[PDB]
Each structure stands twice: as C-alpha cells, then as structure tokens.
mmCIF file of C-alpha atoms in Angstrom:
data_model
loop_
_atom_site.group_PDB
_atom_site.id
_atom_site.type_symbol
_atom_site.label_atom_id
_atom_site.label_comp_id
_atom_site.label_asym_id
_atom_site.label_seq_id
_atom_site.Cartn_x
_atom_site.Cartn_y
_atom_site.Cartn_z
ATOM 1 C CA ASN A 1 49.446 39.885 -12.767
ATOM 2 C CA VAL A 2 50.625 36.112 -12.707
ATOM 3 C CA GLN A 3 54.046 37.484 -11.593
ATOM 4 C CA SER A 4 52.733 39.767 -8.920
ATOM 5 C CA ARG A 5 50.653 37.157 -7.428
ATOM 6 C CA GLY A 6 53.413 34.689 -7.442
ATOM 7 C CA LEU A 7 55.797 37.297 -5.804
ATOM 8 C CA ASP A 8 53.306 37.813 -3.076
ATOM 9 C CA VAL A 9 53.340 33.966 -2.491
ATOM 10 C CA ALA A 10 56.927 34.087 -2.401
ATOM 11 C CA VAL A 11 57.136 36.824 0.208
ATOM 12 C CA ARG A 12 54.764 34.562 2.249
ATOM 13 C CA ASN A 13 57.065 31.783 1.715
ATOM 14 C CA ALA A 14 60.107 33.867 2.643
ATOM 15 C CA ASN A 15 58.497 34.988 5.787
ATOM 16 C CA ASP A 16 57.420 31.343 6.665
ATOM 17 C CA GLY A 17 61.112 30.303 6.311
ATOM 18 C CA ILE A 18 62.224 33.237 8.463
ATOM 19 C CA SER A 19 59.728 32.190 11.362
ATOM 20 C CA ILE A 20 61.190 28.530 11.232
ATOM 21 C CA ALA A 21 64.678 29.999 11.261
ATOM 22 C CA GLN A 22 63.812 32.022 14.195
ATOM 23 C CA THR A 23 62.227 29.268 16.255
ATOM 24 C CA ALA A 24 65.003 27.000 15.618
ATOM 25 C CA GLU A 25 67.697 29.601 16.585
ATOM 26 C CA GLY A 26 65.677 30.418 19.846
ATOM 27 C CA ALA A 27 65.789 26.949 20.760
ATOM 28 C CA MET A 28 69.279 26.636 20.046
ATOM 29 C CA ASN A 29 70.034 29.629 22.373
ATOM 30 C CA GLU A 30 68.279 27.883 25.197
ATOM 31 C CA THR A 31 70.631 24.868 24.231
ATOM 32 C CA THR A 32 73.633 27.241 24.571
ATOM 33 C CA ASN A 33 72.544 28.514 27.720
ATOM 34 C CA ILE A 34 72.251 24.915 29.061
ATOM 35 C CA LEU A 35 75.523 23.924 27.671
ATOM 36 C CA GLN A 36 77.195 26.839 29.136
ATOM 37 C CA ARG A 37 75.809 25.990 32.742
ATOM 38 C CA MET A 38 77.088 22.345 32.106
ATOM 39 C CA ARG A 39 80.412 23.641 31.274
ATOM 40 C CA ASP A 40 80.638 25.794 34.494
ATOM 41 C CA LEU A 41 79.313 22.821 36.342
ATOM 42 C CA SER A 42 82.106 20.686 34.804
ATOM 43 C CA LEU A 43 84.704 23.291 35.664
ATOM 44 C CA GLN A 44 83.618 23.404 39.399
ATOM 45 C CA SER A 45 83.664 19.549 39.630
ATOM 46 C CA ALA A 46 87.310 19.192 38.198
ATOM 47 C CA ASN A 47 88.639 20.737 41.307
ATOM 48 C CA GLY A 48 90.482 18.660 43.788
ATOM 49 C CA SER A 49 88.772 19.996 46.902
ATOM 50 C CA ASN A 50 85.669 18.369 46.299
ATOM 51 C CA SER A 51 85.106 14.493 47.439
ATOM 52 C CA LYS A 52 83.196 11.960 45.537
ATOM 53 C CA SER A 53 79.865 13.444 47.156
ATOM 54 C CA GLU A 54 80.131 16.840 45.653
ATOM 55 C CA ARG A 55 81.014 15.161 42.203
ATOM 56 C CA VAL A 56 77.864 13.087 42.388
ATOM 57 C CA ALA A 57 75.691 15.954 42.951
ATOM 58 C CA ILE A 58 77.371 18.144 40.263
ATOM 59 C CA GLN A 59 76.852 14.970 37.914
ATOM 60 C CA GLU A 60 73.278 14.825 38.883
ATOM 61 C CA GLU A 61 72.642 18.358 37.941
ATOM 62 C CA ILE A 62 74.472 17.789 34.707
ATOM 63 C CA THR A 63 72.303 14.745 33.988
ATOM 64 C CA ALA A 64 69.318 17.028 34.448
ATOM 65 C CA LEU A 65 70.693 19.594 32.246
ATOM 66 C CA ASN A 66 71.457 16.819 29.642
ATOM 67 C CA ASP A 67 68.035 15.492 29.681
ATOM 68 C CA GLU A 68 66.627 19.190 29.238
ATOM 69 C CA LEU A 69 68.810 19.392 26.043
ATOM 70 C CA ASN A 70 67.431 16.066 24.799
ATOM 71 C CA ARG A 71 63.843 17.345 25.512
ATOM 72 C CA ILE A 72 64.575 20.624 23.746
ATOM 73 C CA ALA A 73 66.023 18.653 20.705
ATOM 74 C CA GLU A 74 62.936 16.345 20.764
ATOM 75 C CA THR A 75 59.960 18.739 21.342
ATOM 76 C CA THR A 76 60.939 21.882 19.561
ATOM 77 C CA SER A 77 58.526 22.104 16.632
ATOM 78 C CA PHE A 78 56.861 24.476 14.300
ATOM 79 C CA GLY A 79 53.077 23.619 14.623
ATOM 80 C CA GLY A 80 53.940 20.136 14.966
ATOM 81 C CA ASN A 81 56.929 19.795 12.520
ATOM 82 C CA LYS A 82 60.080 18.876 14.518
ATOM 83 C CA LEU A 83 63.136 20.822 13.748
ATOM 84 C CA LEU A 84 66.361 20.088 15.976
ATOM 85 C CA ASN A 85 65.697 16.097 16.422
ATOM 86 C CA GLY A 86 67.293 15.444 13.082
ATOM 87 C CA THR A 87 64.058 14.470 11.280
ATOM 88 C CA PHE A 88 63.948 18.004 9.673
ATOM 89 C CA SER A 89 66.258 17.316 6.688
ATOM 90 C CA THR A 90 66.932 19.953 3.885
ATOM 91 C CA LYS A 91 63.746 21.675 2.951
ATOM 92 C CA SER A 92 63.504 23.883 -0.264
ATOM 93 C CA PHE A 93 61.715 27.243 0.463
ATOM 94 C CA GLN A 94 60.231 28.647 -2.764
ATOM 95 C CA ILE A 95 60.643 32.382 -2.866
ATOM 96 C CA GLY A 96 60.175 33.138 -6.510
ATOM 97 C CA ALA A 97 57.374 33.987 -8.758
ATOM 98 C CA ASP A 98 58.226 31.049 -11.079
ATOM 99 C CA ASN A 99 58.997 27.567 -10.539
ATOM 100 C CA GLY A 100 62.589 26.375 -9.503
ATOM 101 C CA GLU A 101 63.693 29.468 -7.520
ATOM 102 C CA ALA A 102 63.820 27.631 -4.140
ATOM 103 C CA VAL A 103 66.498 27.975 -1.492
ATOM 104 C CA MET A 104 67.679 25.074 0.632
ATOM 105 C CA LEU A 105 67.523 25.352 4.594
ATOM 106 C CA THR A 106 69.144 22.628 6.646
ATOM 107 C CA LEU A 107 68.418 22.176 10.377
ATOM 108 C CA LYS A 108 70.787 19.917 12.222
ATOM 109 C CA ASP B 1 65.823 6.618 28.812
ATOM 110 C CA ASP B 2 63.011 6.386 31.165
ATOM 111 C CA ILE B 3 59.456 5.903 29.865
ATOM 112 C CA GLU B 4 58.794 9.628 29.514
ATOM 113 C CA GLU B 5 61.780 10.127 27.245
ATOM 114 C CA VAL B 6 60.850 7.131 25.433
ATOM 115 C CA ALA B 7 57.535 8.529 24.854
ATOM 116 C CA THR B 8 58.825 12.093 23.832
ATOM 117 C CA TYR B 9 61.393 10.235 21.317
ATOM 118 C CA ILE B 10 58.524 8.334 19.862
ATOM 119 C CA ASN B 11 56.675 11.555 19.343
ATOM 120 C CA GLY B 12 59.650 13.166 17.863
ATOM 121 C CA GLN B 13 60.653 10.362 15.344
ATOM 122 C CA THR B 14 57.154 9.897 13.907
ATOM 123 C CA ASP B 15 53.818 11.631 13.293
ATOM 124 C CA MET B 16 51.582 8.544 12.495
ATOM 125 C CA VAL B 17 51.185 7.690 16.291
ATOM 126 C CA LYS B 18 51.211 9.530 19.486
ATOM 127 C CA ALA B 19 52.775 8.049 22.767
ATOM 128 C CA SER B 20 52.309 9.147 26.280
ATOM 129 C CA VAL B 21 52.638 7.616 29.734
ATOM 130 C CA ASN B 22 49.804 7.195 32.327
ATOM 131 C CA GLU B 23 49.860 7.020 36.172
ATOM 132 C CA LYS B 24 51.161 3.643 36.395
ATOM 133 C CA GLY B 25 53.967 4.009 33.904
ATOM 134 C CA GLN B 26 52.172 2.132 31.089
ATOM 135 C CA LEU B 27 52.819 3.345 27.568
ATOM 136 C CA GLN B 28 49.945 4.567 25.802
ATOM 137 C CA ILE B 29 49.845 4.813 21.967
ATOM 138 C CA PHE B 30 47.162 6.563 20.004
ATOM 139 C CA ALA B 31 46.596 6.301 16.164
ATOM 140 C CA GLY B 32 44.265 8.631 14.868
ATOM 141 C CA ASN B 33 41.438 7.227 12.621
ATOM 142 C CA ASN B 34 42.237 9.923 9.915
ATOM 143 C CA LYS B 35 45.968 8.714 9.677
ATOM 144 C CA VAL B 36 46.049 5.012 10.468
ATOM 145 C CA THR B 37 43.607 2.462 9.023
ATOM 146 C CA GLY B 38 42.817 -0.955 10.821
ATOM 147 C CA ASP B 39 45.007 -2.141 13.661
ATOM 148 C CA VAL B 40 48.705 -1.384 14.599
ATOM 149 C CA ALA B 41 51.002 -4.146 15.060
ATOM 150 C CA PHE B 42 54.051 -3.824 17.642
ATOM 151 C CA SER B 43 57.063 -5.815 17.174
ATOM 152 C CA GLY B 44 60.557 -5.674 18.548
ATOM 153 C CA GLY B 45 62.447 -6.095 21.933
ATOM 154 C CA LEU B 46 60.902 -2.930 23.402
ATOM 155 C CA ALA B 47 57.515 -3.944 22.328
ATOM 156 C CA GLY B 48 57.898 -7.269 24.020
ATOM 157 C CA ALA B 49 59.112 -5.488 27.052
ATOM 158 C CA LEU B 50 56.031 -3.195 27.286
ATOM 159 C CA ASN B 51 53.652 -5.809 26.147
ATOM 160 C CA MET B 52 51.148 -3.514 24.410
ATOM 161 C CA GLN B 53 47.464 -4.522 24.744
ATOM 162 C CA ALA B 54 44.776 -4.686 22.248
ATOM 163 C CA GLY B 55 43.047 -1.516 20.663
ATOM 164 C CA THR B 56 40.167 0.343 22.045
ATOM 165 C CA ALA B 57 38.092 2.824 19.997
ATOM 166 C CA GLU B 58 38.341 6.197 21.572
ATOM 167 C CA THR B 59 36.341 9.253 20.529
ATOM 168 C CA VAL B 60 35.995 12.734 21.932
ATOM 169 C CA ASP B 61 32.363 11.613 23.558
ATOM 170 C CA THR B 62 34.524 9.062 25.562
ATOM 171 C CA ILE B 63 37.437 11.099 26.786
ATOM 172 C CA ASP B 64 37.972 11.595 30.546
ATOM 173 C CA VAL B 65 40.754 13.471 32.267
ATOM 174 C CA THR B 66 40.356 12.187 35.972
ATOM 175 C CA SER B 67 43.395 10.448 35.364
ATOM 176 C CA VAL B 68 46.634 11.938 33.864
ATOM 177 C CA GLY B 69 46.795 9.180 31.328
ATOM 178 C CA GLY B 70 43.178 9.760 30.394
ATOM 179 C CA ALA B 71 44.145 13.396 29.832
ATOM 180 C CA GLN B 72 47.226 12.494 27.983
ATOM 181 C CA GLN B 73 45.070 10.394 25.474
ATOM 182 C CA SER B 74 42.647 12.892 25.063
ATOM 183 C CA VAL B 75 44.735 15.587 24.031
ATOM 184 C CA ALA B 76 45.691 13.255 21.094
ATOM 185 C CA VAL B 77 41.898 12.491 20.528
ATOM 186 C CA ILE B 78 41.178 16.308 20.375
ATOM 187 C CA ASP B 79 44.156 16.971 17.971
ATOM 188 C CA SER B 80 42.706 14.119 15.653
ATOM 189 C CA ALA B 81 39.216 15.764 16.048
ATOM 190 C CA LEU B 82 40.671 19.269 15.085
ATOM 191 C CA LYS B 83 42.435 17.800 12.252
ATOM 192 C CA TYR B 84 39.278 16.329 11.050
ATOM 193 C CA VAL B 85 37.330 19.494 11.470
ATOM 194 C CA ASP B 86 39.857 21.516 9.711
ATOM 195 C CA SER B 87 39.912 19.090 6.736
ATOM 196 C CA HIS B 88 36.149 19.560 6.397
ATOM 197 C CA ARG B 89 36.321 23.104 6.827
ATOM 198 C CA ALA B 90 38.995 23.356 3.843
ATOM 199 C CA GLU B 91 36.624 21.193 1.759
ATOM 200 C CA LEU B 92 33.768 23.649 2.444
ATOM 201 C CA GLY B 93 36.143 26.738 1.608
ATOM 202 C CA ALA B 94 37.193 25.058 -1.647
ATOM 203 C CA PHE B 95 33.339 24.397 -2.460
ATOM 204 C CA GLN B 96 32.620 28.067 -1.843
ATOM 205 C CA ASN B 97 35.626 29.295 -3.984
ATOM 206 C CA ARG B 98 34.390 26.947 -6.809
ATOM 207 C CA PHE B 99 30.807 28.181 -6.568
ATOM 208 C CA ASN B 100 32.021 32.031 -6.634
ATOM 209 C CA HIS B 101 33.806 31.073 -9.697
ATOM 210 C CA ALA B 102 30.935 29.367 -11.282
ATOM 211 C CA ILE B 103 28.639 32.492 -10.285
ATOM 212 C CA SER B 104 31.188 34.830 -12.112
ATOM 213 C CA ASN B 105 31.135 32.471 -15.137
ATOM 214 C CA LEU B 106 27.364 32.215 -15.268
ATOM 215 C CA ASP B 107 27.007 35.985 -14.879
ATOM 216 C CA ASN B 108 29.304 36.722 -17.899
ATOM 217 C CA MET C 1 24.748 39.339 -2.665
ATOM 218 C CA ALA C 2 23.474 42.446 -4.282
ATOM 219 C CA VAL C 3 23.015 46.228 -3.582
ATOM 220 C CA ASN C 4 19.971 46.261 -1.087
ATOM 221 C CA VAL C 5 18.676 48.203 1.884
ATOM 222 C CA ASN C 6 16.676 45.663 3.975
ATOM 223 C CA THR C 7 19.759 43.530 5.176
ATOM 224 C CA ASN C 8 23.122 44.667 5.984
ATOM 225 C CA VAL C 9 25.045 41.555 6.766
ATOM 226 C CA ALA C 10 28.416 43.797 6.967
ATOM 227 C CA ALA C 11 26.738 45.698 9.630
ATOM 228 C CA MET C 12 26.083 42.555 11.600
ATOM 229 C CA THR C 13 29.651 41.396 10.922
ATOM 230 C CA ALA C 14 30.848 44.800 12.541
ATOM 231 C CA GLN C 15 28.308 44.309 15.567
ATOM 232 C CA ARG C 16 29.360 41.011 16.302
ATOM 233 C CA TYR C 17 33.238 41.879 16.330
ATOM 234 C CA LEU C 18 32.489 44.783 18.304
ATOM 235 C CA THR C 19 30.578 43.008 20.953
ATOM 236 C CA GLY C 20 33.500 40.615 21.152
ATOM 237 C CA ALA C 21 35.948 43.313 21.600
ATOM 238 C CA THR C 22 33.944 45.131 24.147
ATOM 239 C CA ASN C 23 33.496 41.709 26.109
ATOM 240 C CA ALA C 24 37.299 41.134 26.055
ATOM 241 C CA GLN C 25 37.929 44.679 27.304
ATOM 242 C CA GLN C 26 35.485 44.433 29.935
ATOM 243 C CA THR C 27 37.237 41.116 31.102
ATOM 244 C CA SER C 28 40.629 43.006 30.864
ATOM 245 C CA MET C 29 39.084 45.902 32.830
ATOM 246 C CA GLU C 30 37.903 43.619 35.499
ATOM 247 C CA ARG C 31 41.313 41.914 35.833
ATOM 248 C CA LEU C 32 42.968 45.007 36.020
ATOM 249 C CA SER C 33 40.841 46.559 38.643
ATOM 250 C CA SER C 34 40.402 43.386 40.778
ATOM 251 C CA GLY C 35 44.008 42.596 40.498
ATOM 252 C CA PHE C 36 43.071 38.792 40.176
ATOM 253 C CA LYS C 37 43.391 36.913 37.088
ATOM 254 C CA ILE C 38 40.580 34.399 38.121
ATOM 255 C CA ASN C 39 37.563 36.297 39.410
ATOM 256 C CA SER C 40 34.957 33.543 38.531
ATOM 257 C CA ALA C 41 35.018 29.809 37.733
ATOM 258 C CA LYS C 42 34.277 30.638 34.124
ATOM 259 C CA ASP C 43 37.897 31.797 33.805
ATOM 260 C CA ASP C 44 39.673 28.640 35.036
ATOM 261 C CA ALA C 45 37.671 26.299 37.204
ATOM 262 C CA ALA C 46 40.447 24.069 38.159
ATOM 263 C CA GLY C 47 42.551 27.016 38.860
ATOM 264 C CA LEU C 48 40.196 28.517 40.963
ATOM 265 C CA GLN C 49 39.768 25.288 43.030
ATOM 266 C CA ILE C 50 43.536 24.999 43.708
ATOM 267 C CA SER C 51 44.093 28.748 44.199
ATOM 268 C CA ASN C 52 41.000 28.527 46.984
ATOM 269 C CA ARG C 53 42.783 25.525 48.567
ATOM 270 C CA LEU C 54 46.179 27.321 48.704
ATOM 271 C CA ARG D 1 72.508 12.333 78.724
ATOM 272 C CA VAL D 2 68.715 11.876 79.749
ATOM 273 C CA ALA D 3 67.787 15.577 79.229
ATOM 274 C CA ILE D 4 69.659 15.539 75.937
ATOM 275 C CA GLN D 5 67.850 12.449 74.860
ATOM 276 C CA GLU D 6 64.692 14.155 75.833
ATOM 277 C CA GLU D 7 65.448 17.085 73.445
ATOM 278 C CA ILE D 8 66.499 14.689 70.778
ATOM 279 C CA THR D 9 63.167 13.014 71.025
ATOM 280 C CA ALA D 10 61.285 16.087 70.768
ATOM 281 C CA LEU D 11 63.320 16.913 67.555
ATOM 282 C CA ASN D 12 62.764 13.547 66.176
ATOM 283 C CA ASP D 13 58.980 14.068 66.612
ATOM 284 C CA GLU D 14 59.581 17.434 64.825
ATOM 285 C CA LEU D 15 61.210 15.666 61.881
ATOM 286 C CA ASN D 16 58.247 13.183 61.557
ATOM 287 C CA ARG D 17 55.813 16.157 61.993
ATOM 288 C CA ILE D 18 57.494 17.858 59.115
ATOM 289 C CA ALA D 19 57.607 14.871 57.054
ATOM 290 C CA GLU D 20 53.806 13.880 57.514
ATOM 291 C CA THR D 21 52.279 17.352 57.487
ATOM 292 C CA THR D 22 54.081 19.228 54.640
ATOM 293 C CA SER D 23 51.767 19.383 51.625
ATOM 294 C CA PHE D 24 50.818 21.393 48.632
ATOM 295 C CA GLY D 25 47.048 22.452 48.941
ATOM 296 C CA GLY D 26 46.667 19.250 50.906
ATOM 297 C CA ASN D 27 48.706 16.853 48.649
ATOM 298 C CA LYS D 28 51.248 15.475 50.924
ATOM 299 C CA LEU D 29 54.701 15.620 49.896
ATOM 300 C CA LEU D 30 57.559 14.262 52.042
ATOM 301 C CA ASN D 31 55.804 11.291 53.777
ATOM 302 C CA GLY D 32 56.057 8.698 50.923
ATOM 303 C CA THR D 33 52.593 8.955 49.649
ATOM 304 C CA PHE D 34 53.699 11.488 46.853
ATOM 305 C CA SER D 35 55.787 9.299 44.369
ATOM 306 C CA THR D 36 57.016 9.766 40.943
ATOM 307 C CA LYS D 37 54.757 12.233 39.283
ATOM 308 C CA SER D 38 54.741 13.610 35.686
ATOM 309 C CA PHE D 39 54.573 17.259 34.865
ATOM 310 C CA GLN D 40 53.354 18.184 31.469
ATOM 311 C CA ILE D 41 55.802 20.860 30.110
ATOM 312 C CA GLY D 42 55.106 20.525 26.459
ATOM 313 C CA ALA D 43 52.566 21.753 23.819
ATOM 314 C CA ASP D 44 51.653 17.999 22.819
ATOM 315 C CA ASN D 45 50.904 14.985 24.605
ATOM 316 C CA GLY D 46 53.889 12.888 25.877
ATOM 317 C CA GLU D 47 56.425 15.448 26.598
ATOM 318 C CA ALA D 48 56.305 15.243 30.408
ATOM 319 C CA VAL D 49 59.201 15.228 32.967
ATOM 320 C CA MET D 50 59.046 12.943 35.931
ATOM 321 C CA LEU D 51 59.746 14.182 39.528
ATOM 322 C CA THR D 52 60.082 11.873 42.505
ATOM 323 C CA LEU D 53 59.722 13.023 46.143
ATOM 324 C CA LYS D 54 61.180 10.518 48.730
ATOM 325 C CA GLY E 1 74.281 -6.104 62.023
ATOM 326 C CA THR E 2 71.302 -4.200 63.437
ATOM 327 C CA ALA E 3 69.477 -1.719 61.199
ATOM 328 C CA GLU E 4 69.681 1.729 62.791
ATOM 329 C CA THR E 5 67.806 4.828 61.922
ATOM 330 C CA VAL E 6 67.314 8.543 63.152
ATOM 331 C CA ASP E 7 64.043 7.529 64.672
ATOM 332 C CA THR E 8 65.772 4.645 66.734
ATOM 333 C CA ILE E 9 68.765 6.669 68.279
ATOM 334 C CA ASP E 10 69.422 6.808 72.169
ATOM 335 C CA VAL E 11 71.971 9.007 73.527
ATOM 336 C CA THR E 12 71.740 8.121 76.985
ATOM 337 C CA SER E 13 74.869 6.011 76.510
ATOM 338 C CA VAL E 14 78.258 7.180 75.155
ATOM 339 C CA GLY E 15 78.262 4.484 72.317
ATOM 340 C CA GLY E 16 74.861 5.380 71.628
ATOM 341 C CA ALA E 17 75.525 9.078 71.088
ATOM 342 C CA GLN E 18 78.740 8.051 69.157
ATOM 343 C CA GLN E 19 76.623 5.859 66.575
ATOM 344 C CA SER E 20 73.854 8.486 66.552
ATOM 345 C CA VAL E 21 76.471 10.968 65.228
ATOM 346 C CA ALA E 22 76.967 8.749 62.354
ATOM 347 C CA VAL E 23 73.362 8.029 61.778
ATOM 348 C CA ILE E 24 72.707 11.768 61.751
ATOM 349 C CA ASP E 25 75.659 12.361 59.484
ATOM 350 C CA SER E 26 74.140 9.602 56.755
ATOM 351 C CA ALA E 27 70.761 11.109 57.133
ATOM 352 C CA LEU E 28 72.012 14.717 56.537
ATOM 353 C CA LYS E 29 73.882 13.361 53.267
ATOM 354 C CA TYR E 30 70.685 11.749 52.107
ATOM 355 C CA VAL E 31 68.800 14.898 52.618
ATOM 356 C CA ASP E 32 71.245 16.891 51.002
ATOM 357 C CA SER E 33 71.432 14.607 48.002
ATOM 358 C CA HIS E 34 67.604 14.911 47.696
ATOM 359 C CA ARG E 35 67.771 18.691 47.797
ATOM 360 C CA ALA E 36 70.460 18.634 45.083
ATOM 361 C CA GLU E 37 68.240 16.556 42.936
ATOM 362 C CA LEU E 38 65.232 19.174 43.501
ATOM 363 C CA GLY E 39 67.543 21.954 42.622
ATOM 364 C CA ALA E 40 68.601 20.410 39.410
ATOM 365 C CA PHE E 41 64.990 19.970 38.887
ATOM 366 C CA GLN E 42 64.214 23.349 39.408
ATOM 367 C CA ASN E 43 67.093 24.688 37.174
ATOM 368 C CA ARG E 44 65.866 22.216 34.505
ATOM 369 C CA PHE E 45 62.179 23.539 34.542
ATOM 370 C CA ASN E 46 63.603 27.355 34.393
ATOM 371 C CA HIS E 47 65.381 26.512 31.327
ATOM 372 C CA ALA E 48 62.372 24.639 29.976
ATOM 373 C CA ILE E 49 60.177 27.589 30.877
ATOM 374 C CA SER E 50 62.658 30.085 28.989
ATOM 375 C CA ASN E 51 62.655 27.782 25.876
ATOM 376 C CA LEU E 52 58.958 27.609 25.914
ATOM 377 C CA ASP E 53 58.384 31.460 26.311
ATOM 378 C CA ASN E 54 60.962 32.167 23.361
#
C-alpha cells in the first residue's frame, strides 16, 4: 500500500515535470521564431542596395525583437518560478515510490 | 536597459521583492510582510542613481488603481494577500486532517 | 457525519454546483445569442466604458 | 506659385488637424500629449513594455 | 542658420520651394522612422501574444 501510494505521488511528480518542460519548450519555440525573424532582417540588411536609413530601420526592428527575447527569458515562469532566465538550475524530480529515485532536469 | 527592463530583471532575479515602474518613471519596490521582516536597505550605484525613499505600509484596504503605479503596486499587494490567505487555508486543512485522524483513533 | 435523513449535505453540494453551472450556461448562452461578450457592466465595467467610448 | 502655396497651406492645415484630432476613444495620440506609456503584457506586475508616440 | 519646419515653408519664391523640398524630405524621413518603430512594436507585441497564449 505504501508502494502504491508512493507510485501515485511519483506519477503526480512526473506529470509536473512534463508540465514544466512543456512550458519551457513553448517559450523556446517563440524564442526560435523571434530569432528566425532577426536572421531574416540581418540577411536583408546585409545587401548593398540599402543606404544607412534602411539599416537603421532594420536595426530598430532587430532591437525590438532582442528586447522581446530578453522579456521572454525574464518573464517565462511556472506559477511564479522563472525558467529560462538562468535562475532555474538543475532540479531533481522525484519519480519513484522510494526516496533517491529522482531525475535531474536542467533549464538553460 | 531602460527602467521597465530593469524592473523585469529585478523580478526575474529575486522573489523577495517585487519591482515595477509608475507613470513618472520612478521605480517602486514592494516587500511583502509575509516575506520580509523590517525595513529594506538599498545600496549600490543603481540605488544611488534611483534614490529610493522611505517605506510606506500598504495593505489591500489602501490600494488604488487610478494611476498605473498604483495598479502595479496593488498587484503585488494582492499577491501577498493571496499568499497569506492560502497559508491559513493550508493550516486549516491540516487541522481538519488531524482531527479526522483523531476521530478515527477515538472511534477504534 | 452519520447516516441520517433530516439533513443531506451532499444534496446541498450538488445543488450549489448545479446552480453555478446553470448560471455559467446562461451567461454563455446570452453571450452567444447577443454576439457581444459584454452585455452588462457586471461583466467588465472598464471594458464597457472603453467600448462605449470607441 | 501663389496658388501652389495656397494648396500647400491647406495641406499644412490638414497635417495639423490630423496631428491634433487623432485619438483612441478621446485619448489624443499624435499631438505630443501622449508620451511614453507602459503596456502591461505580463502575468505579474513589473512586466510592462514602453511605447512612445511622438 | 535659421530653423525651418514644414509649417513655415513658403513656395511663392523659387528658392523657397527648393528649400521646402528638403524640409519635406526630412519630415518624410522622420515620419517613416516613427512608422518603422511602431511596426517593430506591433511585431514584438504579436510575438508576445503568441508566447503568452502558449
């Protein structure tokens, strides 16, 4: 009975870990989209047909996207626990019926 | 970084205090009474540049949202109040569990 | 509790949640029939004010 | 040249009118009274983004 | 040097019109830069809305 109750708790904990990973990866997907837009803007700006004004406009858009990247990094949280700002170091998710059966998850 | 990015960075780095910006660009810092005991002392170059003022005791009864800074501070006030209410609810639930166990023991 | 006939607390729980669900269903039906999310200030007072001004 | 200047004066007055009358429900935008404003796009306080209208 | 603006152009003379050409060019560049800033703001907010929804 102790083992079965611990296994129920372990399923709970594994689901919570999957939830955290899902939220973090969705935020990373938005980050990837913003990065691809930035790369397209940089490729467009590298062309010699543009004068300095077009480069300035593209740099303004790239700065806005960069600030959006920082905002996503600093605000993405799981209930108030930040994920992609670097403060979320390795966390051990306990997915066993007995103690000492945890798995480490790192968020960069 | 501008003042709002500074507030977002402060929010991401720590959970003891909550930072926001009002309409005049002044940086507001809220320390919940269930997370901080006594006054908070500010030091460093950025603290000297901002020149943080003395502490005012805020409660849910004294919040107003007629200004953007008022709403920003009231959000943190309500968060602290919610944390306090949830803590007392958890205490009551533990009490009820304990009394149910006591009733079972007394019955047997 | 015990096994009694005078008070049925579970029935009261069911009635409370049934009335809550009925109120939610009525609100959703009103919003669907009217086509407007805000039909009263009890929905969103500030939203109603800004939508009226717009 | 005087006729072209009259048309240019009319267009200048139209530019001033556009600057002074455009608003969002009555909140003027392009006349300078609208300044740096913070839009709250986060679930917690202090996650706003600044927008300036010149 | 004298400070010229769009509101103070006067094309009744050839030199006046020649100067107003440059004044309007600078005004157009300024308006285009502010439009680019607003477009970047809209794109950033669209990305923010997508993240927040996810």
